[PDB]
């Protein structure tokens, strides 16, 4: 699907090399527009990167570092926007790509790269790279970005074949004839921002951003601001228009929300609509999230000083805080929804700052939604599961660990997960690895929880499956479909038969049983104490003391009662609470 999210890992070492590349493949296969940063790092010689073929635009910056691979096929990339920048300076950073026959990047091959709207270029310590010293970078930088830094190292360990003789000014991205830099700014007639040629009638419209196949606002190679169904525009159409006489708001039916550099009739799945017409991943100040009956969340206005919210890591007062710890565990007391993330790390426990004791973890027993991510790299040996989050229902992943993962469990050796209420990972990837004693992984129906095709479970080095089956560690037979989060009848995704509390069971106690029960939506629920259990029949029709087939003791119609109330009554012949004759 055309728009993917990016990552945010900078130069940090991926913790699971064995799955690192499937994460990139999953993010990027089919993606044309990276809503974030494109970071390609720690890739070995034999890494196939064909899934990058379709990328045209990168909203953030592009980072290519510590790779032994020889080619990154980014030939379709037209435009880097530089919304964020590597080291707050660079839109493109190519660093340390080469061995510490042979390996390392040989040619950038960015032949469609015509526009860098903000930021500059850093290229350092690439032993086998050629042609980079050839490029007229000032042509690629936007008019308002001419003073972008360019810090470029040309130290190589080999000789370069010249640019193909096809190349105009001997400026190229590679030795091939399709690798000549095409210039779109410095070679233009008049004051033209971008042209497709030397004439003044080649010249692109003022709303295009990288070039054009013509003079119109529908002929742009990229939009400088917004794409409105094929037309590049300065802004989208407002959701509201004003009555020419009275100025009452009128819903504009050509109305659109802003999403990245697009106009859209509805924000996409995990995003929030604002009254301002944006699609955001977080309400801007003094707003509250409001959830329609569609499950479709809006950022509406605060009608007063807004209620209190539980922020998690990376929000408000917890913005700069690394881990959940003893110092801040009470911050979560009584929270049902956390705006932000929760990260548990070795320092959470092995502390000045104390050790977070396992029982304090119960604060999260009331937790149903996390809007950021959940990351666990440490967890007390004495707890076999993640049941303190039994009631967690959804992780949105509007913020993801390393830009990538919405759920992450590693180095724990818990024994099962037990996140039994977890029904949705709204976005982001699930990385579960290096949990020696962890079974019940493939017992979870992962893709019932995922919401878009760029999501998957990456898992390696947990307890091996044959070792789980060889100890009878499998879903209890009452769980439907063979899907569960741990051992026993409480851990099922759905009971085949009935539910008593959290326990799946074969039969409620309608006919045989110590405390007799009725049924309600495949639940076993108690008959009132004052119902006499009936041999060979149903004992009760519901919870209330007046839904017995017959009374255990006395009756004060309509209710079976333990004793007649002292407004003075007494038991008569047939057990009925008659009133005393004198008060």
């Amino acid at each position: 699907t055309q728009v993917c999210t990016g990552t945010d890992m900078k130069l940090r070492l991926p913790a699971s090399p064995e799955t690192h590349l499937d994460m990139l493949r999953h993010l990027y296969q089919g993606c044309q527009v990276v809503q974030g940063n494109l970071e390609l790092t720690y890739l070995p010689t034999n890494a196939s990167l064909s899934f990058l073929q379709d990328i045209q635009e990168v909203q953030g910056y592009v980072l290519i570092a510590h790779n032994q691979v020889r080619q990154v096929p980014l030939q379709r990339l037209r435009i880097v926007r530089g919304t964020q920048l590597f080291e707050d300076n660079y839109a493109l950073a190519v660093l340390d790509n080469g061995d510490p026959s042979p390996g390392g990047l040989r040619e950038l091959q960015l032949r469609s790269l015509t526009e860098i709207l903000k930021g500059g270029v850093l290229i350092q310590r690439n032993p086998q790279l050629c042609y980079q010293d050839t490029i007229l970078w000032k042509d690629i930088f936007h008019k308002n970005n001419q003073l972008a830094l360019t810090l470029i190292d040309t130290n190589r360990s080999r000789a370069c074949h010249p640019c193909s003789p096809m190349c105009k000014g001997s400026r190229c991205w590679g030795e091939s004839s399709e690798d000549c830099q095409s210039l779109t700014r410095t070679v233009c007639a008049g004051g033209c921002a971008r042209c497709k040629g030397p004439l003044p009638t080649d010249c692109c419209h003022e709303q295009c951003a990288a070039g054009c196949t013509g003079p119109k606002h529908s002929d742009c190679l990229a939009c400088l601001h917004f794409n409105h169904s094929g037309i590049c525009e300065l802004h989208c159409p407002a959701l509201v228009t004003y009555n020419t006489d009275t100025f009452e708001s009128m819903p504009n039916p050509e109305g659109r929300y802003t999403f990245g550099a697009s106009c859209v009739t509805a924000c996409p799945y995990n995003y929030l609509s604002t009254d301002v017409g944006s699609c955001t991943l977080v309400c801007p100040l003094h707003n509250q999230e409001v959830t329609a009956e569609d499950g479709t969340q809006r950022c509406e206005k605060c009608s007063k000083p807004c209620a209190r919210v539980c922020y998690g890591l990376g929000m408000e007062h917890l913005r700069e805080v690394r881990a959940v710890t003893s110092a801040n565990i009470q911050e979560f007391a009584g929270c049902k929804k956390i705006f932000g993330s929760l990260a548990f790390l070795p320092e959470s426990f092995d502390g000045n700052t104390a050790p977070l004791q396992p029982e304090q973890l119960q604060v999260f027993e009331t937790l149903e939604e996390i809007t950021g991510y959940l990351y666990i790299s440490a967890w007390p040996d004495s707890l076999p599961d993640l049941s303190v989050f039994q009631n967690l229902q959804v992780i949105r992943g509007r913020i993801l660990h390393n830009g990538a993962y919405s759920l992450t469990l590693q180095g724990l050796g818990i024994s099962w997960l037990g996140l039994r209420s977890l029904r949705e990972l709204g976005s982001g990837l699930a990385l579960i690895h290096h949990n020696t004693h962890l079974c019940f992984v493939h017992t979870v129906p992962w893709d019932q929880l995922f919401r878009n095709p760029h999501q998957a479970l990456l898992h390696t080095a947990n307890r091996p499956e044959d070792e789980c089956v060889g100890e009878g560690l499998a879903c209890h037979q009452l769980c439907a479909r063979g899907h569960c989060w741990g051992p026993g009848p409480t851990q099922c995704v759905n009971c085949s038969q009935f539910l008593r509390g959290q326990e799946c069971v074969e039969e409620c106690r309608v006919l045989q049983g110590l405390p007799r029960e009725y049924v309600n939506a495949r639940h076993c629920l108690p008959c009132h104490p004052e119902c006499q259990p009936q041999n060979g029949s149903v004992t009760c029709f519901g919870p209330e003391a007046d839904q017995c087939v017959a009374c255990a003791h006395y009756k004060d119609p309509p209710f079976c009662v333990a004793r007649c109330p002292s407004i003075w009554k007494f038991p008569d012949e047939e057990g009925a609470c008659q009133p005393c004759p004198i008060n």
Partner: antibody
Amino acid sequence: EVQLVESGGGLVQPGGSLRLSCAASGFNIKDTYIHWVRQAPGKGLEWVARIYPTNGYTRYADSVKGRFTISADTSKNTAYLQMNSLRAEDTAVYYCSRWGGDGFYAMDYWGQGTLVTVSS
Amino acid sequence: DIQMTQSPSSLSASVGDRVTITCRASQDIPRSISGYVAWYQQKPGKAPKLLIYWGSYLYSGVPSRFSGSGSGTDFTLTISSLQPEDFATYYCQQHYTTPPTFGQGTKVEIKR
């Protein structure tokens, strides 16, 4: 003293929805059951629903079953009746009544009634 | 369930005369409902007033000329000295079972 006051009732289209509110006063409804009885124009009294606020247990006449939900917010000392999917036959005047004390299950106190008409 | 069936459905008496509405329970869970029936008075548009509870006990504020008797599954509300105020529909109710059901109503009218 003691009373109840029905409110939030009037006019609705066929297949519509409305929320009757029954404001208790002069006693706390945790101590007893609260009833909705309705009366069509020039017809008898039809019991519609009960609730025991303490635990929220509810019972319904078969006619309204799975269309009118009755609930009770203990904090306010008030009882509600969310009608959905209003049929034409639901056109009547709606009284909320209480049962009395613990062992006294006659409808001793009643409200004033609000009219509810189902017609476009 | 239980059906309550009042009779007559309507009547017309003169001031001071004795009036007698009956109510008849219908079920196959019989026993003896007698002491678990109530009577209510309703005037056009106005909300019902409780008259009698537990079969024969007179509710406060209600004139003594109103009385109620019963035994088995057959119950009787007498009005021993009809007054012009007494124009109304009178209903019986049982709360021996749930839901508690009302009779069809007996319309009283003053022969003048």
